[PDB]
């Protein structure tokens, strides 16, 4: 006679992540606008015929 | 040295209420006539996020007492689902705090 079992294998699934996406506001915008054009408003025109 | 994010120098609120704090009889603390409550954002709890992702992988790998959820209605899968949120979570707290600084080389140097 061959005495019974003895024999078991580890439950056991081995950890890691996938997909985890870096989706922090670090760099969360990049546009923009002037703040207004140059133009000249300190002089007159002088137009006596 | 109290350190506020480079991008939060406003990070500060205020309320003042004329009703002082009181204690139940027989309790702990003073008489004050002025308490405060503060509520605080801060970078340093990322160490309880990435406490909870030792505490993940050294027991969910060994995959014990998973079938205890399972058996209630849970699968493994949402086990991993909420796994992967929290790292969103917690690699966020890993890049929030950092410098609204931008380009590449060093800051300063020398030339000829």
Redesign the interface.
Known sequence: HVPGGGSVQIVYKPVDLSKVTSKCGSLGNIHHKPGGGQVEVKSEKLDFK | SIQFVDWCPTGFKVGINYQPPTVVPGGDLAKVQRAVCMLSNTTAIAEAWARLDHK??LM????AFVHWYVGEGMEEGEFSEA??DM??LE??YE??G?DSV?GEGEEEGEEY
């Open positions: 993940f992988d969910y790998a060994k995959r796994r992967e790292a969103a690699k966020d890049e929030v950092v931008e």
